[PDB]
Amino acid sequence: MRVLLIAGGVSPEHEVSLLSAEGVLRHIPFPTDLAVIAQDGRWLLGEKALTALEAKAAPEGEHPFPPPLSWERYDVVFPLLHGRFGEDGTVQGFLELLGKPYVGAGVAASALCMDKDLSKRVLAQAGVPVVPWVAVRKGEPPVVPFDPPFFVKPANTGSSVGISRVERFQDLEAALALAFRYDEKAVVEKALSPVRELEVGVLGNVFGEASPVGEVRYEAPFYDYETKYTPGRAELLIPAPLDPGTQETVQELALKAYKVLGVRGMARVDFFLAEGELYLNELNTIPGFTPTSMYPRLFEAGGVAYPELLRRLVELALTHHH
Amino acid sequence: MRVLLIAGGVSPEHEVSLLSAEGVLRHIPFPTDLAVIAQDGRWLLGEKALTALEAKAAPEGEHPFPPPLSWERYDVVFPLLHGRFGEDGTVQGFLELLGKPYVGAGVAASALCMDKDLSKRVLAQAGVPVVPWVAVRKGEPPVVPFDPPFFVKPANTGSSVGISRVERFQDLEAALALAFRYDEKAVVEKALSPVRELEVGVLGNVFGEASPVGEVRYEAPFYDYETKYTPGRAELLIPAPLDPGTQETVQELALKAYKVLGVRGMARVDFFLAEGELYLNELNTIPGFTPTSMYPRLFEAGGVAYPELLRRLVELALTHHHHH
Ligand SMILES: Nc1ncnc2c1ncn2[C@@H]1O[C@H](COP(=O)(O)OP(=O)(O)O)[C@@H](O)[C@H]1O
Ligand SMILES: Nc1ncnc2c1ncn2[C@@H]1O[C@H](COP(=O)(O)OP(=O)(O)O)[C@@H](O)[C@H]1O
Ligand SMILES: [K+]
Ligand SMILES: [K+]
Ligand SMILES: [Mg+2]
Ligand SMILES: [Mg+2]
Ligand SMILES: [Mg+2]
Ligand SMILES: [Mg+2]
Known part of the structure; x- marks a missing residue:
């Protein structure tokens, strides 16, 4: 079983995606080649991708899309790209047309969860509280x-x-x-202040299994880029110090949103808690796997070890594709 | 200005797509090459694509995706691929990654408008009447x-x-x-019975312009596949017999839905009318261009002839990809 892991990308989250790839490559229990999309859109393969991984940023690539990659040599593709052109249904459309099993949400779920306006319209109609x-x-x-x-x-x-x-x-x-x-x-959006940020991981195809709920504590005016990825700037509380009824409602709301949007593979579902009211902030279908990232930690605490989590993701990809 | 027209596809609308390509190829005012996705997902190019179009079905293709063609040679791609994989954001996602302008709605609007549940959730949330x-x-x-x-x-x-x-x-x-x-x-869905069916064309990027409102009548129990594509079976009334207040209300509703969903390029917006009571039925981002299709006739009645309609679609694709 050979996995192709794609990381980097042209979105502003390029560096975050290479950190995610380092995390996944350390734990994934299958033979796995890396392919890197540089910031100029051109791909790097083989040793050049592993070099770009080590530098934690690749501004320029070699091969214009679509790359001269022998896709038939891989059983599953793991698209570990964050944001535009990776998490938004573009890469997923390419992989659907390739006819290759791939990890994570399909085209519609990916495009919708990336769009903070459209996702809010769907979730609000479905009875899920939003800001x-x-x-x-x-x-x-x-x-x-x-x-x-x-x-x-x-x-x-x-x-x-x-x-x-x-x-x-x-x-x-x-x-x-x-x-x-x-x-x-x-x-x-109307800003909630003060606010507690809660995050919960989901795993599965449409009908999900929810992880324990985690909480993000920080000092900054909000959970900004610097607070997300600078070591020590954010404290991840796992499980969150959350009253029992709210903890139950977070998990029920995350699973309902996941099912309504038809998400496959995984998502991290993020919530706000303000004056005792819950609001679903967003779903992220390719959550980060960096050293400061919440999603793998949430399932590790819930009894799903990091290599087991990646095994399940790869196996959910094979199962959906039949 | 060179166009790559893609037609066929793996969806059940494969044959309809080939019929639409015949209509678009007849009128498109640009050099246009045809690529055909056969029902098995393999592609046909060059002379084999044109032969398969003549046959009006292509069960078996030659080239596994991604096909051996230079996308750089084309200025715009026109996916004329109705239904799953072609109209639902899939081909659009691939084309975004090529950095290639393409006709019609982007990934999210395409995916939304092909899903009859999620589109209705969005439209109902925005206050649009639906069944x-x-x-x-x-x-x-x-x-x-x-x-x-x-x-x-x-x-x-x-x-x-x-x-x-x-x-x-x-x-x-x-x-x-x-x-x-x-x-x-x-x-x-709850059935409306009886019901009149109204369709309106939209053209433009997010802030569209509406064609006149057309109406579809027929003898069959509903607007089924045979009624849609049998010559003469469907009656296509343009403009629809409506009082002007109703006409403006249908056009405004179609433009509202178009803007909320973020549609680009084009859409045919279809409605139900039940003794004056209006419901938006669905949007189609790649409407048909068959000999019995409504979208070109609607804009024909709005003073946009078939070649000019297709020109504007290509122009709108270039205006969005560049600049936006
Ligand atoms: N309505 C809001 N009220 C309070 N804080 C918010 C609100 N919206 C966003 N934030 C802050 O901004 C951060 C990022 O917002 P988010 O919508 O999750 O975008 P991204 O997908 O880039 O994380 C949140 O984690 C939160 O800290
Ligand atoms: N709720 C409904 N009430 C009455 N007729 C309907 C309803 N839904 C569908 N129909 C009939 O079926 C046809 C096709 O339905 P539609 O939702 O437009 O699917 P498609 O995308 O396959 O055309 C409609 O044009 C109409 O004739
Ligand atoms: K998101
Ligand atoms: K549709
Ligand atoms: Mg967030
Ligand atoms: Mg996010
Ligand atoms: Mg219809
Ligand atoms: Mg339709």
């Missing part, structure tokens, strides 16, 4: 019916890139300008 | 809160394939079994 928000298109003025503080985001982002906590209505124009450098659509 | 429905997954006990008559559908279908009109609870099991031959998820 008040509006969508904003580039070149169009925002119509924000709620009062600040706000969070402003590109609709398709990850690792808090392009996100701003906005406290003045006057700072909203600059915040949207920054958001529009990453996407043609943005979301303005 | 009562539930989603049923394979192996799950169907929990339907309303009484029959039902319409049962594969969640990802087109051209009415796998759809049953269900009059009695006893007939629900056979209808779900039929729907589950095509998808792992199905929808059960």
Whole structure:
């Protein structure tokens, strides 16, 4: 059984994805080759990918897409890319057309969970509590019916890139300008403050199994990029110090969202807790596997060891593809 | 300006796709090469693609994906691939990775508009009237809160394939079994009976312009596959006989849905009319271009001739990929 693991990517989460690949490669129990997508979109294979892994960033690649890769030599593809062009259904569409089993969410689930506006519309209709928000298109003025503080985001982002906590209505124009450098659509959400951030891992095809609930504790004004990936800046509380009824509701809501969106393989489902009210923040279908990442730690605490977790992901890929 | 037209596909709408390619190739005002995805997922190129188009079906292809062709030579790709894998975001995702402009909706809008459950969830959330429905997954006990008559559908279908009109609870099991031959998820909708069917074309990126409203009438119990593609079976009324307030309301609803879903390039937006009561039925991001298809006729009535409609689709693809 040969696995092809793809990491890097052209999204702002390129470096995060190479850290994820280091984590997965340390534990995956199958023979596994790495393929790296550089920041310019060109791929690196063989020894050049392993070199780029060691540098933790590859700004330039060798082969334009699609790469001269002998796909038939691999049984499963593990797309370990985060964000645009990797977690959003693009890579998944390519792999579906390749006819190759692959780890994680299909095209629709991936595209929808990446879009913070569309996912919120689906989940809100399904009865899942979400934060008040509006969508904003580039070149169009925002119509924000709620009062600040706000969070402003590109609709398709990850690792808090392009996100701003906005406290003045006057700072909203600059915040949207920054958001529009990453996407043609943005979301303005009502900021919850104070807020506790809860995350729960799901594993399985449509009908999921939930991990224990974890909590993110930090000092920064929000869980920003620097706080997410700088060692020691975030404390992951596993399991979270959470009252029993809320813990139960987090797991029920995560599994319901997972099923409604038809997610396969895995997701990390993230929630806000403010004044005793739960809100589903987002699903992430390719969660990070970095040394500061929550998803593998959550399942390790729930009795699913890191090599067992990757085995299940690979086996869920084979099972769905039949 | 060179176009690569892709048609065929592995979905049940493979033959309809080849018919649409015949119509687009007749009028497209650009040099256009044809690639055909055969029903087995292997591709046909060059002379074999044109031969297969003449045969109107291609069960067996030659080239495993990804096909041996230079994508760099094409300025735009026009996926004319109805249904699963072609209209549902899959081919769009591959084309995004090529860095290639392409006609029509992107990955998320394509995936949403092909799923009859998730599109309805988004549209209902935005306040768009839609028929009562539930989603049923394979192996799950169907929990339907309303009484029959039902319409049962594969969640990802087109051209009415796998759809049953269900009059009695006893007939629900056979209808779900039929729907589950095509998808792992199905929808059960409350049937409207009788009902008029309205369709409106949209053109543009996110902020579209609507064609005149057309209406489809027919003798069959519903707008089934045979009625859709038998010459003369379907009556296509353009403009629809509606009072002007209703016409504007249909066009505004189609543009609202188009914008909420983030559709690009084009869509045909289809509605039900039940003694004045309006429901959005579905959006189709790759509508048909067959000799009995509504989308080109609708924009024809709106003063956009067939070659100009196809030009604008290619122009809209270039305007989105570059610049945005
Ligand atoms: N509505 C909100 N209220 C409070 N904090 C928020 C809100 N939205 C985002 N944040 C903060 O920003 C972080 C990143 O937001 P998120 O939507 O998860 O984007 P990403 O997918 O990039 O992580 C969250 O973990 C949280 O710290
Ligand atoms: N809820 C409904 N009530 C009445 N007729 C329906 C309903 N749903 C579908 N139909 C009939 O079936 C046809 C096909 O259904 P539709 O959802 O548009 O699927 P497709 O994408 O296969 O065309 C419709 O044009 C209409 O004639
Ligand atoms: K996400
Ligand atoms: K559709
Ligand atoms: Mg995220
Ligand atoms: Mg997040
Ligand atoms: Mg349809
Ligand atoms: Mg239809």
